[PDB]
Design a protein around this motif. Sequence first.
Motif, PDB file in Angstrom:
ATOM      1  N   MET A  11       0.688  -1.330   0.130  1.00  0.00           N
ATOM      2  CA  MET A  11       0.104  -0.117   0.387  1.00  0.00           C
ATOM      3  C   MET A  11       0.627   1.266  -0.248  1.00  0.00           C
ATOM      4  SD  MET A  11      -3.372   1.574  -0.277  1.00  0.00           S
ATOM      5  CE  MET A  11      -3.928   0.094  -0.134  1.00  0.00           C
ATOM      6  N   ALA A  12       1.813   1.656   0.924  1.00  0.00           N
ATOM      7  CA  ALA A  12       3.104   2.660   0.837  1.00  0.00           C
ATOM      8  C   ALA A  12       3.822   2.507  -0.414  1.00  0.00           C
ATOM      9  CB  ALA A  12       3.615   2.284   1.859  1.00  0.00           C
ATOM     10  N   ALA A  13       3.738   1.536  -0.941  1.00  0.00           N
ATOM     11  CA  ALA A  13       4.813   1.402  -2.827  1.00  0.00           C
ATOM     12  C   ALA A  13       3.487   1.775  -3.236  1.00  0.00           C
ATOM     13  CB  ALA A  13       5.298   0.254  -2.743  1.00  0.00           C
ATOM     14  N   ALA A  14       2.542   1.677  -3.362  1.00  0.00           N
ATOM     15  CA  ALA A  14       1.533   1.914  -4.290  1.00  0.00           C
ATOM     16  C   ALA A  14       1.175   3.618  -4.157  1.00  0.00           C
ATOM     17  CB  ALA A  14       0.003   0.853  -4.522  1.00  0.00           C
ATOM     18  N   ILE A  15       0.919   3.689  -3.097  1.00  0.00           N
ATOM     19  CA  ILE A  15       0.911   5.450  -2.426  1.00  0.00           C
ATOM     20  C   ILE A  15       1.503   5.913  -3.506  1.00  0.00           C
ATOM     21  CG2 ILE A  15       1.011   7.354  -0.861  1.00  0.00           C
ATOM     22  CD1 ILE A  15      -0.684   5.009   0.759  1.00  0.00           C
ATOM     23  N   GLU A  16       3.289   5.553  -2.663  1.00  0.00           N
ATOM     24  CA  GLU A  16       4.684   6.519  -3.583  1.00  0.00           C
ATOM     25  C   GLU A  16       4.320   6.965  -5.000  1.00  0.00           C
ATOM     26  OE1 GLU A  16       8.098   4.072  -3.364  1.00  0.00           O
ATOM     27  OE2 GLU A  16       9.164   5.332  -2.067  1.00  0.00           O
ATOM     28  N   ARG A  17       4.100   5.265  -5.566  1.00  0.00           N
ATOM     29  CA  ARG A  17       4.204   5.301  -7.112  1.00  0.00           C
ATOM     30  C   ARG A  17       3.205   6.308  -8.135  1.00  0.00           C
ATOM     31  NH1 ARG A  17       1.275   3.098 -11.202  1.00  0.00           N
ATOM     32  NH2 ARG A  17       2.340   2.492 -12.716  1.00  0.00           N
ATOM     33  N   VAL A  18       2.540   6.795  -7.410  1.00  0.00           N
ATOM     34  CA  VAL A  18       0.773   7.788  -7.616  1.00  0.00           C
ATOM     35  C   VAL A  18       1.565   9.408  -7.155  1.00  0.00           C
ATOM     36  CG1 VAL A  18      -1.262   8.693  -7.191  1.00  0.00           C
ATOM     37  CG2 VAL A  18      -0.373   5.974  -7.608  1.00  0.00           C
ATOM     38  N   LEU A  19       2.017   9.003  -6.005  1.00  0.00           N
ATOM     39  CA  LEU A  19       3.157  11.040  -5.812  1.00  0.00           C
ATOM     40  C   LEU A  19       4.355  11.235  -6.309  1.00  0.00           C
ATOM     41  CD1 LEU A  19       3.193  10.463  -2.107  1.00  0.00           C
ATOM     42  CD2 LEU A  19       1.044  11.551  -3.937  1.00  0.00           C
ATOM     43  N   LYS A  20       4.949   9.827  -7.370  1.00  0.00           N
ATOM     44  CA  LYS A  20       6.301   9.789  -7.607  1.00  0.00           C
ATOM     45  C   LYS A  20       5.792  10.539  -8.977  1.00  0.00           C
ATOM     46  CE  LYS A  20      10.081   8.667  -6.680  1.00  0.00           C
ATOM     47  NZ  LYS A  20      11.305   7.814  -6.338  1.00  0.00           N
ATOM     48  N   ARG A  21       5.021  10.114 -10.032  1.00  0.00           N
ATOM     49  CA  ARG A  21       4.220   9.833 -10.700  1.00  0.00           C
ATOM     50  C   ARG A  21       3.566  11.439 -11.788  1.00  0.00           C
ATOM     51  NH1 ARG A  21       1.413   6.217 -15.218  1.00  0.00           N
ATOM     52  NH2 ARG A  21       0.005   5.138 -13.430  1.00  0.00           N
ATOM     53  N   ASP A  22       3.411  12.215  -9.976  1.00  0.00           N
ATOM     54  CA  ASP A  22       2.574  13.658  -9.617  1.00  0.00           C
ATOM     55  C   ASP A  22       4.027  14.393  -9.470  1.00  0.00           C
ATOM     56  OD1 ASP A  22      -0.015  15.210 -10.292  1.00  0.00           O
ATOM     57  OD2 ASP A  22       0.499  15.347  -8.425  1.00  0.00           O
TER      58      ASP A  22
END
Lengths: 118, 120
Positions: free
Chosen positions: B14-25
């Motif tokens: 869940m922390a990696a999926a959140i991080e992926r979305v934020l990084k992409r943004d």
Amino acid sequence: KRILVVDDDQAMAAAIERVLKRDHWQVEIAHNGFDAGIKLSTFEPAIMTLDLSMPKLDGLDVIRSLRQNKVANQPKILVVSGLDKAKLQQAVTEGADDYLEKPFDNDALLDRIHDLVN
Amino acid sequence: QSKRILVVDDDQAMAAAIERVLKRDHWQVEIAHNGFDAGIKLSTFEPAIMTLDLSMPKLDGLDVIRSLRQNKVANQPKILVVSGLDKAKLQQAVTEGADDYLEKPFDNDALLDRIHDLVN
């Protein structure tokens, strides 16, 4: 002369605080990892006592995070052992400076503390 | 103001999926899986925003919020609370000072709307 006591057991943490206040130490207490994390640079202590029988805090990972995040003001870690001994031996291996074993005297506490800074 | 976000969650995926979305943004992201790491990284990383999971079995999100108020930490992040089943804990977190909340499960754009709202 700043000491941070980390223990979830409030009665024990209070009892530790009393002995340190007699020996003229300024004490702050954290019952959890987050609070311990904050007080490490909000209070900015010289020694941290870290209890290893906290169900919701793993002492090893505290030691791990401390030396692998390049944190300034890294205190001396006095680890408080109890139920486990594999935990204790690898906490000193991971980077705990000295320890106290259950049971420990009030004098054994202060001698451990004074050996840690001097 | 900065683009730094600390994601606090014991659920590594869940922390990696959140991080992926934020990084992409285009946000700079760090992750803490436990409270001690969260508290340490709040100093060393100085995030503008902290996402805080309310379903961490070893962390009480109320203790985080209260510890921030009681210790009077400088340069506090805005707190986005990420809530699960316990609705009373959600409301308690918000009343005690959480800046916003996000109910799990959420889409990528629901995460992004909250993050952008906190900085606008």
